[PDB]
Subunit: 212 residues, 4 copies
Amino acid sequence: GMKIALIIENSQAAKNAVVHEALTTVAEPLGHKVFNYGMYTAEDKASLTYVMNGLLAGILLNSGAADFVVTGCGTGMGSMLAANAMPGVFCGLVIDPTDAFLFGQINDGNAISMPYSKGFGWAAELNLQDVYRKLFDGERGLGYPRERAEIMRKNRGILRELKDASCRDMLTVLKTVDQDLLRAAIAGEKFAELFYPNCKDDAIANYLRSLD
Amino acid sequence: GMKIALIIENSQAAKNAVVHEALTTVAEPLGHKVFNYGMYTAEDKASLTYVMNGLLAGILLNSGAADFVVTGCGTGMGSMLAANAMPGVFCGLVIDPTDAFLFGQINDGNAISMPYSKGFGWAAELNLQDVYRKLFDGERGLGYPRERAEIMRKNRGILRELKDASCRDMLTVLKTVDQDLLRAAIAGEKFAELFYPNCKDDAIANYLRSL
Amino acid sequence: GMKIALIIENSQAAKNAVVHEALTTVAEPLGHKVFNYGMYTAEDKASLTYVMNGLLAGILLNSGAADFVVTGCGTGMGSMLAANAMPGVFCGLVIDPTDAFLFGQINDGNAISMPYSKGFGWAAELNLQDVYRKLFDGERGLGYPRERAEIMRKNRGILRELKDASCRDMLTVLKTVDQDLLRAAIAGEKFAELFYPNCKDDAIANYLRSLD
Amino acid sequence: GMKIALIIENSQAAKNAVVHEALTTVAEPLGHKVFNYGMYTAEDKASLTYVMNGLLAGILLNSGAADFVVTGCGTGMGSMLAANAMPGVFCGLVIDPTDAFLFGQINDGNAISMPYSKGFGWAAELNLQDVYRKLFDGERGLGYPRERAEIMRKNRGILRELKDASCRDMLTVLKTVDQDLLRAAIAGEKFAELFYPNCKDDAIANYLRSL
């Protein structure tokens, strides 16, 4: 069972319900728990940009409040970039079910960003489900092909070490980032309710509270 | 014009020639210069993994030896992840020409990673040309939809600040990363010839020289 | 130059303006003439279904009133199936520019059907232009892969003979098709204006005229 | 279930085994029967062109020897065009699993043609299965969006009538097509074996034997 967090920015806010619905439909019966961090509607007082999506993703993943993050934007590129700017975050840009499958088996990342405008029309919510089914059902990182799973597992490790060298720890990032950006990123009405009970890292929880 | 660098890892080395040709076919007539960092063939003594492609991309972009990097792997995911792990690197995963277009206009990043196995069959080399045409011709960062242009321009800025806060400077990364991984990343037969005459950061050049 | 006809059915009528603009932007500078047969708006009294799209394509191509037809629907599948049920119509289902390029070089058909809902989001209208550029600029049927160029040229010919064996001439079709379907197909407010002056086949012009 | 026929032309004959495997893997457990009419390899004596794929599809479908036909070519366009030239054949060009789903639900055709070269790279066989699961599991033509359901069902009928008007009966077609084309279409080593015991139209069976 995974704690899966959903984060949606203002350009695509009106699509949050649909996406949340696809996600709960697939992940809940699989024994996971879905947390909708919003935006819930385009009229939310607490508005998010794709940059905040990435920052929030970093908070959730590093704190243990989420095991996996689902996000995106019009094309999904913005949110991908922002998320990958964060320590400990490995965010794929996933389009189809094969992409999802391979992402899960080869890269075994902890976030995905998808397009919710570009290529998103009739039945796009059905592709979302197909993708969720590839990601959240089954063991991840077994590699494809399972034989070649060795080189891949190794490389993933080397990547983590490389990123450990480039990126500062999340707490440091929280202390040094634009503080209005940070406040905005966590300003959602349900944030406190969803986060604090699930946050395993006291220092992060303490810092964020300290903003009050 | 732009200095555009090509970097291919071992799983797709056999495709470096096809990718390079597509790339020079479009970029040269546009007045750009293409630097092929290899791998050139599956048999190259200096082999690259997708992690090294990312590391090498950070060296090239932060030193100024390249203005733009073209990379990838079977899916392009691995190189995307590694590249984006690096300071000052904003690497897109591009599939089709509309992806390319939007990347250029919304994100105005400095690298792209593409799949060279998945989806790669007939006329895939032509799609590559269509994508390069979108990327290397015209003004970037003008935004799409246009009504979202200012917001977008500002957000790119805010994103650069965010990453500046999260990532250490490239020179620091070089001194602190696995040193054998670094040596491997720059081991290419032609690395020196392509790199040093174009590097604008002496501290980086001199450090790599010291290895 | 070519005479290029645009046909849009009811589910996507709202998009006729966008498709029509992508089309003229590319085709006119290339020295082609574009004929918009509607639907122009979702508000048109003369409504078309995808079955009519195919029938009209047949009328236009066999009559010589058009040299190429651009149509579609939600997915483009309906209009494709309807277009291809007609004599002398070879309609491709095209998604991306490589598809378009390959269609022109291998099949050299006289119609295309494209999705106007599935996959149709941001910049979808730019992909349209990209596709048009591959279809309406340069020589057709030169083949890809180039080594199969003759084989491909022969096959197109054999295909034509096959369809000649299966399909009745357009005139016969017109005389035996559901007359209500046919009447609705040509009920468009601009049909006459666009058609008769370009129709090369008097027999077809005659037959339709008599239906008033 | 259904009797599902697989037809592969020469440009992609080397891929027949992989396709047959994706299809059996999915379709059989679902209670269907898969009939592989070849080509089996690039070296079959009896070679198929995309034009024959279409001709053969009409034979199988109209004779009731198959309920559904799976075919294709490099792009799938040729087999699609040829298949659709035939009476009683409604062949979609399917790329992805959503395409497949919508086809089954909106158009409820009896054949599909897919690309076995364009876009067919690494891991392409996984998508094949994804597509087949959409096609061969569940009821068809229930519409999507179901808010256009009845409309959709009405239109398919209208389309079948239109095509009845345009295309000649299959036996008339068999008597009037180039007879060498026809012979080559059914020259496959297992044709008789697969077709005859399943043909529900004696007049077609008789005519083909009359050859």
